[PDB]
């Protein structure tokens, strides 16, 4: 069988973390402060190794996910080969009982140095910190701080257990040369150095390791022997690399900065420029207050909504932008599928009061929808000719007549504006011919209050007539090939059967062209002109 | 060098510098002890040293080993600014050297921290994921999105991070040709197995592989909606996809979404994800441009589209391919009728043959000659368009003018 | 808060935190000494302390002052990781507190370095100047520029740094209107004193102040060459400029370069810098754009241009202003002759009256009607162009059709 | 000034400000020892000193040289946070000065590290090359794609680094008058030889 990510397996992984945490800290105590093991702790030593033995024989039955195609290999042979060449050799040595072997083979201290191979299983705890660091429910700053503390507490604990071991290498006759047998803190003797107690003998070693790790160095406890000098130099040199690493992590988080730091830094540079010129007294209040709103009015700027699949981005857009589109007067009577296409490609922008969106005389390439705030139109002394309110769309008049912008628009209050490009706007118009004529048709009916449309009425009247002529060609082509299914759609959506193309032709003429009686009586029931005349003088009956 | 690591190649240099300086200082410090005569050795840093029961009462002829490790021990402790104080300068000349040596380590010690800090400033892969997630979380929580849609957005960003779906940030430096071989290394085997692309020319296939994109989808998601016009072409290469009561199961090495990409027919089915799937997508703009250039390649694909319910769809596409050919002439003649110079140029170099006529029969020369557009007539003669072509009336383009 | 400094507002916080922690640790450490009974005070950190001849043989009833400063002294030394060792823990309970207190300072100590480092990462004004200078030096030395031109480039970059000529990096955040008042605060007094802009409307002047740019020039430089078309308008605000044997000295509060901007006459003189001068420049594109909108403002400037050698120039510019009016109708009729609808749209909303005729007399309606451009004829109707206008032939636009 | 190395100037300034502060502290620490009368000099930080067999008992009329260098040695050791402990404050007035001086070094010491870190973090124009290639290499190793294709792309990056001299040029904050003259000295010899510009006027090719 295979157990890739079963919930029971995920419980076993967390279960063995307790054993990994226990054997990582107890090993230095077993190596340094113990000679063999008492019968009380014999059960824990045996039970601990059996638990890790199960893990060794169980990781051969666990699938691993492919690093190239993400395919969950699930193969018996691939799982074994991956584990054998990575960690199986060192994981098996630790599981071997180095205590009973040590006692069985007489009393050899050299064979007991292999007991330190069990310090490798602390890597389980390091993986746990990485595992919970990717979790979003836990604070990221909290995780980094705790990991640094643990990685330093464990190193200090190991050094304390090795410092005491070096003192026990010398026989009791010459214990005066050791770092501890010659200690005298206050009136305490420390002369015997043995059978004092396991507690005060350990906390004085840990106190020695902590002081030297933080580079304090009181000097009350220090190395006296040549073997202890060598270990001290290695341990001290190790702390310089580790100590600089601790500072590097702390500096990296702070250097990343904060939002208020960026706001302060930007304003500080501006303030020096203003004070250099000594310009204005109330001018500072105008500009300093302006930066206050800019800091607050920044929520969707530089949005990271880009690494999202198009399917997911479709639904979220239709849940927020859509309730602001069908209320626009320009989209009266539009079909559901047409208004769906446009809402996919909309972009959201925020404009601070006082900013200028479009300048007079500039080419228009973006279509803007108003959702929040108010906008002011300026043209000429500045004269305000129009005020824009929410649910209004501006920039469509100059986007269809191909004219430059005739009235610059500024921002009077904090506005939320939806923006669409001109290039994609025409593509949707071309695809939806039926709904494409209604956009300009509804625009034309607005020639009651606005004066810019009145002077542009001639151009709009040309486009609606030109587009209507294309409908007749499509309508006539439907009857030529005898496809009544498409003909019904072409007439209900404003299509007029009594439509004449450029060359005098009529749908009735094409209906009788191929002798299609089924298409014929439909036109008659639609009150078609039977005696319609073309410049060639070909009546529909004569052509038949 | 690229064979060796870069983190390893710089950590060792820092260790070597601090190792060599301590070795030099240890040997120089011992030299200052030997400057004084043996009669007044009690004024030195080592002649008066006494750690435990060891007395150093001679400071000479002890051995070259214990007399060196005690000097090295004093130098290493001073360098790390630990300063136990068991060994320290006693003489005026040793104080001067200690002042110079200690002041040198302040610059060197700060240099060690600077290199280590600069190595950690470069964020890790998971460091940027947390920063990205917070920005997305803040934006989507401000708009108060529903809890149902919160899980899909948060769950999907996790999948992209673990799978490294993007993996193309630093990729524009590839000079196209180098990137071209990379794309066909991982995507070609799945494309060649697609039934729709059977019989396609090898050169044409390699043109679209470079423009593909890779993404993954979690189970339960919906890629395309019922009755929705699609604009992306997807190729299944992993997992199982279900199309909506079930109808058909999207087996691997298949393609979907191509019905609307050419026939403009809205998608009649909804694709539901059943298990983890790897999907390759292609954008509308690239697909349209390649088809326009490779007219011959499109014919092979169109013929095999019918071969690849299925019987009804095969008859339906025959109706649609007929009208699109005729639809070219409708706008081709309309542009000539209105005399739009630039509009006509679009449908000739990347369109159809201008010599063909519409359903009634009207060559663009017929409309141009009748409407009296003198300038446009200079363009039709370039393509050697027939001038004696007769419509279903008995007239000629010359007669219309 | 903006009134108080920022680096000051954060250095004090770091000092306060390290001051409060040492105060707390000093009081807690002394409490551990009093836990033991007075009979066994020799096991404490202070009962056994002896610095010089002072013995601390009682550790109590000494005074609350010397017994506190010695505890504070032990805490401050430990915090800075100096560790003299004269005072240290002796008891088991004091070792545990020392281990906890020392471990806490490592996190706090690294926090102090991080805040200080982030304050220095922000480069200084002179820090970026050196980085910029090296990049310019590298590029200009690679091309092997002459030593004569090396000094001008290096000399001018120094002048920009000291004078802060740019001083507009973080300036786009100003919402135009706020920036508009700033521009007229420093530039208006120099513009109003210019003889060229005498009699100009106040509203028109403020429109060009916002778009000016400031720069400085070293003595000996040349701003414009002989017979070179000038596309920049400069205003003298400081220093002395000499124009080339000298002819005329450019006194302050003057303007130059306007002859080539409007009359298209190549510059007949070279301007040589004599002393440090402050010059305001305006780009060609904006000046033409503003003049198009304010036709009335341009007329006032044109009339005062002649008033502002000088007699010969005034007669010459009268010839140029007359022909530019006629030149508008030449390209206006040509656009109508060729039927370019879009080209004509540019010369109507930003040009002259279409009703006017050329030298021979040819209204754009005359050419359009004769050439049979039906579509453009509707445009002239909307402009209320005269239909009965007669050229110097006796014909009418209708008769041509 | 551009003729002097920028890294050299920053290092020397940090050394001088560190040397001057240490010199002042050494001259003030010795002053505090002279405030007490000679009768009770045993309480001072120096009157009770004994390094090896040297007495330091009199503390006066020893010599101005060895009496100063032992004070400077005390100031240097505490400034670098070494703290041997052979010389330390013994009096209450010296404890107060030591705490103020030690607290001052924490601010100054962190400032020294900040300047050194800022220079290194700024860049080296070589770690950026290594960082850019390292990210690409991990992507290639993740997919395990190709063997000889690695040489094609790794070699490609070698030329990209070498062929980057005018990229991101800073020739923008230069007046138009200066930029006009330099352009005519470099770009112009490559323009008259273009076949498209045969028989063109001097002022047209200048624009």
Residue numbers in the entry:
A (entry chain B): 74 to 453, 458 to 621
B (entry chain C), C (entry chain A): 208 to 451, 460 to 523, 529 to 621
D (entry chain D): 208 to 414
Question: What did the paper state?
Answer:
Among these channels, the Stelar K+ outward rectifier channel (SKOR) functions as a K+ efflux channel for long-distance distribution of K+ from roots to the upper parts of the plant. Interestingly, SKOR contains an intracellular ankyrin repeat (ANK) domain, which is absent in all the depolarization-activated K+ channels with known structure. Each protomer can be arbitrarily divided into four layers along the central axis: a transmembrane domain (TMD) comprising six transmembrane α-helices designated as S1–S6, a gating ring formed by the C-linker, a cytoplasmic domain homologous with the cyclic nucleotide-binding domain (CNBD), and an ANK domain.
Besides the wild-type SKOR, we also determined the structure of an SKOR mutant L271P-D312N (SKORmut), which was reported to convert outwardly rectifying SKOR into an inward rectifier, at a resolution of 3.1 Å. Structural comparison of SKORwt1 and SKORmut showed that the pore domains of these two structures are almost identical, indicating that SKORmut is also in a closed state. Notably, our electrophysiological data demonstrated that SKORmut is a non-functional channel, rather than a converted inward rectifier, which was consistent with the closed structure in vitro.
